[PDB]
UniProtKB/TrEMBL annotation, chain B:
Gene3D superfamilies per UniProt: 3.40.1190.20
Protein name as catalogued: Fructokinase
Alphabetical keyword list: ATP-binding, Calcium, Kinase, Metal-binding, Nucleotide-binding, Transferase
Pfam families reported in the protein's UniProt record: PfkB (PF00294)
Species for this entry: Vibrio cholerae serotype O1 (strain ATCC 39541 / Classical Ogawa 395 / O395)
UniProt: ADP 2 binding residues: K185, T218, G220, G223, V240, N280
This enzyme's EC code(s): 2.7.1.4
PANTHER family: HEXOKINASE FAMILY MEMBER, PSEUDOURIDINE KINASE-RELATED
Length: 291, 307
């Protein structure tokens, strides 16, 4: 087997209005979305993290097992509760969502929740895991161990100021993670938010000292900006400019990580280009399903 | 014209399983259930308490106004969440409840939220309101104010240790409220836990020195045992089709308190016995639909079941 992508962070149950007096149970959370995306490509994906010993936590355990994601290292906190979102409708029927549990069980990820890592494996992290302690320090420890054993680390800062008890620590904590990552996925505005000169130019030029092996930037319909310290390149979805990646950022990551993980040499420029091709493929695939 | 019944505590949105992938968005919570049960019996009930500024709390304000409980003294906490309970099933082999929000907005009930009380009125309190500060002191303060003015206090130690940040404080805090109430509703296992006893007779002699005007111990399906300083009696009941026990006890309290609230003197023995009979009726009836409030009967429906 040997090839494997580890995923960690917030497993989330979304509650959607199924008309009136009814909510639909929908599994969510960016780490779980990417984890499922990889397993749907017949890839080997495993999830470690913390949910609550509650029905919603059990829903995610069942969902992930069904989707063939290994969740043997999924823990159930007897006290804290699984992250739960309720989306709400306007007078005009326009969506709005509310975090129901703060802070959720995922924020209490412990050092003993971290599984043994093997050489050549991948670890993917989102910013929510870096919001508060003990999850902040536990996640960084997971990163260090993955690298120490000869593994690789990807990072996608799906940043939301909400979950943070101390929003001021965000710019420094996330840019800290960017420094330790092998692959970093940036949204256009995300790259900007860390002081963008209105362009993705010097916003890019800034991170140069970090010497990140691979940086990928979504570009709505323009496709995907691919950045290596040597080169610079755009990999469009060669089809009359398709569409965006609304909610398909996770699917994008999944397709990217699945291909990079099974590569003999993911550092290869040719291998990277093919991986981005799949990533755009997954991203487009998700947004054609009315999503 | 008759006695107003004040209700306070946690207004809760219950998520009840409808199939494998759906949840029923149902209004619940002890004070809200009892307030609604009283109103549906053409009784006069009002609610004072605290919910989240979130829409789950707007949902409960709407449900109370429609039912039609007074909630002028309903407040919205601009920081904390409205209590959300997810009911599932519990192998070995019944139902199970789980509190998703800790602490919820009702735990932050303030002294300023307490309305003016009047002689003859009623106040019902669930033990969840004593769980944490400042709700604990606020609720204890409200209980006292009703007693001082010549009102009456009802109390239901609906035990849920989960919401207590200091679970060791539960027994002493609950038993304090027990000694302050006119009416107390016990489960057979509740009275046992709080008294450290095993038999119902022992649990009664234990609390016998509080001289509580009325103690009710639900005997599950045999009805309830009715305890007064002088006399003990059993009051029977009839069975139905249990398909959702959610809030059956809150329905019991609803029927009990309404029947007492309309009497010129509720201390009358026959009145008390008739009230429990009402309580058994409303309790069983609520277990015929999904949701705590959904099957709370009007007078016509309740008389039809008892007749
Ligand atoms: Na019910």
């Amino acid at each position: 087997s040997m090839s494997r992508v580890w995923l960690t962070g917030d497993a989330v149950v979304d509650l959607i209005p199924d008309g009136q007096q009814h909510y639909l149970k929908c599994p969510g959370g960016a780490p779980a979305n990417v984890a499922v995306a990889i397993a749907r490509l017949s890839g080997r994906s495993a999830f470690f993290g913390r949910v609550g010993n509650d029905p919603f936590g059990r829903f995610m355990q069942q969902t992930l097992t069904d989707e063939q994601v290994d969740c043997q290292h999924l823990h159930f906190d007897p006290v804290h509760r699984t992250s739960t979102v309720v989306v709400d409708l306007d007078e005009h029927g326009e969506r709005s969502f509310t975090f129901m549990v703060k802070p959720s069980a995922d924020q209490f990820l412990q050092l003993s929740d971290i599984p043994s890592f093997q050489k050549g494996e991948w670890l993917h992290v989102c910013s929510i895991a870096l919001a508060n302690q003990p999850s902040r320090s536990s996640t960084f420890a997971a990163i260090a161990q993955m690298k120490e054993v000869g593994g690789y680390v990807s990072f996608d800062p799906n940043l939301r100021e909400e979950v943070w008890s101390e929003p001021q620590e965000l710019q420094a904590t996330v840019m800290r993670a960017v420094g330790l990552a092998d692959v970093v996925k940036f949204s256009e505005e995300e790259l900007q938010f860390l002081t963008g000169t209105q362009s993705i130019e010097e916003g890019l030029q800034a991170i140069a000292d970090f010497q990140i092996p691979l940086v990928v930037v979504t570009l709505g319909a323009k496709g995907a900006l691919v950045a290596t310290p040597n080169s610079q390149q755009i990999v469009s979805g060669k089809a009359v400019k398709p569409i965006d990646t609304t909610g398909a950022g996770d699917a994008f990551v999944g397709g990217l990580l699945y291909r990079l993980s099974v590569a003999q040499d993911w550092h290869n420029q040719a291998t990277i280009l093919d991986a981005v091709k799949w990533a755009n493929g997954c991203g487009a695939l998700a947004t054609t399903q009315k999503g």
